[PDB]
Ligand binder design. Structure first.
Ligand SMILES: NCC(=O)Nc1cccc(OC(F)(F)F)c1
Ligand SMILES: [Zn+2]
Length: 286
């Protein structure tokens, strides 16, 4: 059977919160079969657990919420879990946000590969898209289509000159393309306009050229930090893989994003969940 996977060892990392700009302690731990990914606040008393599920989502990022308790910036760590096939894990945090690390899934990939993968004696569950499901918000669209595999496409025509008056497009089919090699290390674009406004309000205190490609009114300030061609759209694909993992299982299907973001992604998850004839849970015997 294709088996569930968890981590082989506990790993401890530290970084800084995107919003607080202060130290956060990150601990990844093995977890039992059918746990999913579960976030816990070990700075709180008693410790508060929030499963990484679509119905626990409460802007420019994905936030999990249970009452007055939150975990911000879950999408890059969930992308790494999805891209390495981790079904089951505990994520312990000393604060209300995942550390930003270098702004990609890369550091989480490295931590998981370093901890090692442990096979579990239970069949891995997949969510198979059986029919098309789409959501729209003005000119924005997000779509699930049936596909024998896992494929993530993204397109945006954005009217800032960094983009040269051209639509940015990328497609990744994970049967041919490596998540680790071709997606995991993509950083997002941070517009000075937006960052300066947040910092004036004592927000986004952790953001910098260390964790984003910083762009002014016209252009990229440090091209030396660029890792990929079409890096902005590769980051949107990284983001979407993380958001899709809130379904709780690996997807058998195709995602198509048209100027979509965290908000329209989560609306697509909720529309899929409601349309119960559009998906099924399947296992494989190799
Ligand atoms: N998925 C959304 C995302 O990756 N956002 C993000 C990443 C790094 C830095 C940052 O903040 C800032 F630097 F841009 F301000 C915001
Ligand atoms: Zn992101």
């Amino acid at each position: 059977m294709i088996k569930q996977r968890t981590l082989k060892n506990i790993i401890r990392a530290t970084g800084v919160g995107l919003h607080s700009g202060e130290k956060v302690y990150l601990t990844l731990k093995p977890a039992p079969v059918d746990t999913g990914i579960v976030f816990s606040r070990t700075d709180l008393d008693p410790v508060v657990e929030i499963p990484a599920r679509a119905e626990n989502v409460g802007t420019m990022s994905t936030t999990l919420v249970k009452g007055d308790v939150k975990v911000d910036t879950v999408e890059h760590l969930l992308s790494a879990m999805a891209g390495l096939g981790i079904d089951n894990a505990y994520v312990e945090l000393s604060a209300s946000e995942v550390p930003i690390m270098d702004g990609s899934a890369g550091p989480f990939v490295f931590l998981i590969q370093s901890a090692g993968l442990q096979e579990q004696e239970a069949a891995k569950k997949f969510i198979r898209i059986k029919r098309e499901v789409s959501v729209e918000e003005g000119d924005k669209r997000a779509v699930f289509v049936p596909f024998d595999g896992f494929k993530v496409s993204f397109e945006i025509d954005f009217d800032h000159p960094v983009f040269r008056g051209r639509t940015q497009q990328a497609s990744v089919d994970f049967s041919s393309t490596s998540f680790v090699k071709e997606v995991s290390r993509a950083r997002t674009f941070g517009f000075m306009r937006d960052i300066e406004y947040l910092r004036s309000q004592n927000l986004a205190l952790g953001g910098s050229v260390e964790n984003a490609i910083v762009v002014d009114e016209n252009r990229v300030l440090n091209e030396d930090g660029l890792r990929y061609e079409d890096e902005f759209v590769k980051h949107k694909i990284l983001d979407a893989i993380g958001d899709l993992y809130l379904l709780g299982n690996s997807l058998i299907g195709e995602f198509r994003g048209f100027k979509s973001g965290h908000a329209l992604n989560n609306q697509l998850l909720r529309t899929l969940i409601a349309d119960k004839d559009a998906w099924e849970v399947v296992t494989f015997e190799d």
